[PDB]
C-alpha cells in the first residue's frame, strides 16, 4: 500500500527496488516492500535506508526471504520449503553485478550452481550428482561453451570435424587448454602446446606453428596467425565473437 506519494524508492543490487515508508507505523518501524519474480515481499525495519529483511510465500507454499545489507551493497534471496528452514535456493548479489546462485537437495547438498561475473559472463553447473559430476556451460559474450563438470575438473569442448578443443578448469580454477585431432594423416594433423605463463595455446600443423589462441583474463579469446614458415606472428590478433570463428580456427 506504498505509493509514490507516501514512500521512497531505493535501487538495490540485482536490479531490484524497495519502497520504504516515509512515516513509521506504530511500533516505530518503517515498512518495506520489494517485488521479485512476481511476489511482493514485505518486512519492517528500524532504518529507513532500504536495508532489512523481507519475506513472502509462493503459490507452491515455499517461503521466500530477502536480506538487504545495511550498506545496500549486497542482497541475499533465499527460498525454503514450507517449514521455513530447509533451503531450496539461495542467491547472493553484489553492487558490482556479480552474483552466485545455488540449488540444494534433500540432504543440503548443492545440485546446481550459477556463477555470474561482473562483466556478465557466467559459469553454469546443472544436474550435479553426489559423485560430483554434472553438466557444465560457460556463457561468454557471443557464444556458449558446453561441457561437463567432474570431481576433478570442469571441461568445455568445441568440435570442428576431427579436431576437439577442450577448456579445462581445475578445482583451484586456473584454465588449461588441450587439443586433440582424430585425423591420422601426419601432413594435416593439428597438435597444440599450452603455455600457462601466458595462457596461450599454440597450434601446429606439419611441424609449423599456425595460430595462437590466447585465453584472456577478461574471459575472451583472441586468434592470431603465424607467417607461412611458422616462425613469427603476423599483424594483429582478432577477438573471437562467435562460435563459428572458434570452429574456423580449428579447421
Amino acid at each position, epitope marked *: 500500500s506504498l505509493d509514490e506519494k507516501n514512500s521512497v524508492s531505493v535501487d538495490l543490487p540485482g536490479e531490484m527496488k524497495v519502497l520504504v515508508s516515509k512515516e513509521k507505523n506504530k511500533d516505530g518501524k518503517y515498512d518495506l516492500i520489494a517485488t521479485v519474480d512476481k511476489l511482493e515481499l514485505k518486512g519492517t525495519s528500524d532504518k529507513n535506508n532500504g536495508s532489512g*529483511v523481507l519475506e513472502g510465500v509462493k503459490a507452491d507454499k515455499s517461503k521466500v*526471504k530477502l536480506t538487504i545489507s545495511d550498506d545496500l551493497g549486497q542482497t541475499t534471496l533465499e527460498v525454503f520449503k514450507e517449514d*521455513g*528452514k*530447509t*533451503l531450496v535456493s*539461495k542467491k547472493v548479489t553484489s553492487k558490482d553485478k556479480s552474483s552466485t546462485e*545455488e540449488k*540444494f537437495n*534433500e*540432504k*543440503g*547438498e*548443492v545440485s546446481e550452481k550459477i556463477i555470474t561475473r561482473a562483466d556478465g559472463t557466467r559459469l553454469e553447473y546443472t544436474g550435479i550428482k553426489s559423485d560430483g559430476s554434472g553438466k557444465a556451460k560457460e556463457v561468454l559474450k557471443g557464444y556458449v561453451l558446453e561441457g561437463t563438470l567432474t570431481a576433478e575438473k570442469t571441461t568445455l569442448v568445441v568440435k570442428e570435424g576431427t579436431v576437439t578443443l577442450s577448456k579445462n578448469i581445475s578445482k583451484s580454477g586456473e584454465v588449461s587448454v588441450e587439443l586433440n585431432d582424430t585425423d591420422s594423416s601426419a601432413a594435416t594433423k593439428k597438435t597444440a602446446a599450452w603455455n600457462s605463463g601466458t595462457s596461450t595455446l599454440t597450434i601446429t600443423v606439419n611441424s609449423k606453428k599456425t595460430k595462437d589462441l590466447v585465453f584472456t583474463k577478461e574471459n575472451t579469446i583472441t586468434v592470431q596467425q603465424y607467417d607461412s614458415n611458422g616462425t613469427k606472428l603476423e599483424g594483429s590478433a582478432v577477438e573471437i565473437t562467435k562460435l563459428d570463428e572458434i570452429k574456423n580456427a580449428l579447421k
Partner: antibody
Amino acid sequence: EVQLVQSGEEVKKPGESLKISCKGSGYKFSSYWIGWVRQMPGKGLEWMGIIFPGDSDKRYSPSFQGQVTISADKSISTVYLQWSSLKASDTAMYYCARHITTHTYRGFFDFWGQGTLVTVSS
Amino acid sequence: QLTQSPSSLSASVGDRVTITCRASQDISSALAWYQQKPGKAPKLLIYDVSSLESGVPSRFSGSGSGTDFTLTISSLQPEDFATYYCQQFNGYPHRLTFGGGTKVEIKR
C-alpha cells in the same frame, strides 16, 4: 506434530553394551538429518553424530568417531545410538535431535527428544 | 572457537537483556541460539543469526556480523529465566560447537 520419543532411563555397569533409540513422528522421517547430543552432569552440550535415515549416510563428530555407532531403521522411523563397552564417564543425558543443514552455510537442531538418562557405575 | 561472555547474568522481569557470543574466526551466518531449563531438553530460539523459530515469542531477537553475535530479549518474562547456548557450524568436515552457556537469573 513433530515429535521425537526416546527410549527410557538406563542404569548399567561398566563394560556392558547398550543401544538406545529415538522414534520420530509428524514428518517424513527418512528425509531429514537426525543426530545425537551428549550432556554430562552439570556440563554443556556436545554433538556426537548425525545420520540421514533415507540412505544411512553418517557424519560423526571427531572425538566421538570410533567410540559409538549410530544407525537407523527407516521402516519404523527409529534412529539408534550404541556402545560396545560403556565406561563410567559415559554417564550423561543423551538427546536425539533433528538436524537442519545446508552445504557449508548452516547446521543446527530444530527439534529435540526428551532425553535419555544413562547411568554407568560399578 | 566459541566464547559466550556474560556466563551469568542477573535481571528483572521487564528488563532488556543481551547475551554475546564471540567466534575465533568468521562464521558468516552459521550460528544458532538455544534455551534450556533444568531437567528439560534444549529448545531452538534463533537460527541463521537472526531468524526466529516458529512459535518463539517476538521479544527474542538475534544479530551479529563476522565473529560477534548477540541475543537480545526485549522485556524479560518469568518463563525466560533459564540457560542460553549459542552454537556454530563448520562444513569441511561436519562440526558443531556449542558455547559454554549463559544462566539468566532473577535479580534481587
